[PDB]
Amino acid sequence: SMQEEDTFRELRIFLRNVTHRLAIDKRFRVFTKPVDPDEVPDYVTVIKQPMDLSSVISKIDLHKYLTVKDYLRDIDLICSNALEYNPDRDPGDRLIRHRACALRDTAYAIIKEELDEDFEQLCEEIQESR
Ligand SMILES: CC(=O)c1nc(NC(=O)C2(N)CCC2)sc1-c1cncc(N)c1
Structure with missing residues (x-):
């Protein structure tokens, strides 16, 4: 319905805002x-x-x-x-790993604080019906 398409549009608006806030964080x-396939060639091989x-x-x-789960x-x-x-103990590796986990923790914290549980539940129920 149009109500359902409004629900998904609200979700997209919310997801763009969260993603923008992540992407501007230094x-x-x-x-x-x-990852540039020229700049580092072994990436596209290890990361499928x-x-x-x-x-x-x-x-x-x-x-x-x-859904926000997606x-x-x-x-x-x-x-x-x-x-x-x-995965290595080198400081370059440890820095990226620390940042990766911070990215993850930040996104989950923003969603937990700002996304209404019932809104997400509605999104999921519409999804299960398709
Ligand atoms: C995304 C990712 O996982 C990634 N990881 C990197 N790791 C390192 O350079 C080492 N510490 C381990 C090799 C030294 S570089 C890199 C990346 C590569 N091209 C572009 C962008 N934006 C990031």
């Missing part, structure tokens, strides 16, 4: 663009499912997120990718 600059904040914005606009799966993917590609 700590998260490394997660804002895809790359994900970044600009790709998150594209998926929002393509209506690929019908969105948080891709946030989780940005983080776990970073942990897996950077």
Whole structure:
């Protein structure tokens, strides 16, 4: 219905706002663009499912997120990718890992504080009916 399309539009508006707030945070600059396949060639080999904040914005606009859970799966993917590609004790690796986990914790905290539980529940119930 049109009520349901209004629900999803509200979700997209909310997701764009959260994603913008993540993308302007200086700590998260490394997660804002895809990994250049020239700049580092072993990435697309180790990371089978790359994900970044600009790709998150594209998926929002393509209506690929019908629930905040769908969105948080891709946030989780940005983080776990970073942990897996950077597993070493070197300080470069530890810094990215620290930032990846901060990205994840920040997104979950914003959603927990600002997304109404019933709004998300509605999104899920519309999703299950399709
Ligand atoms: C996204 C990611 O996981 C990522 N990880 C990197 N890791 C490192 O450079 C090391 N510490 C381990 C190799 C040294 S670079 C990088 C990245 C690569 N191209 C572009 C952008 N925006 C980030």
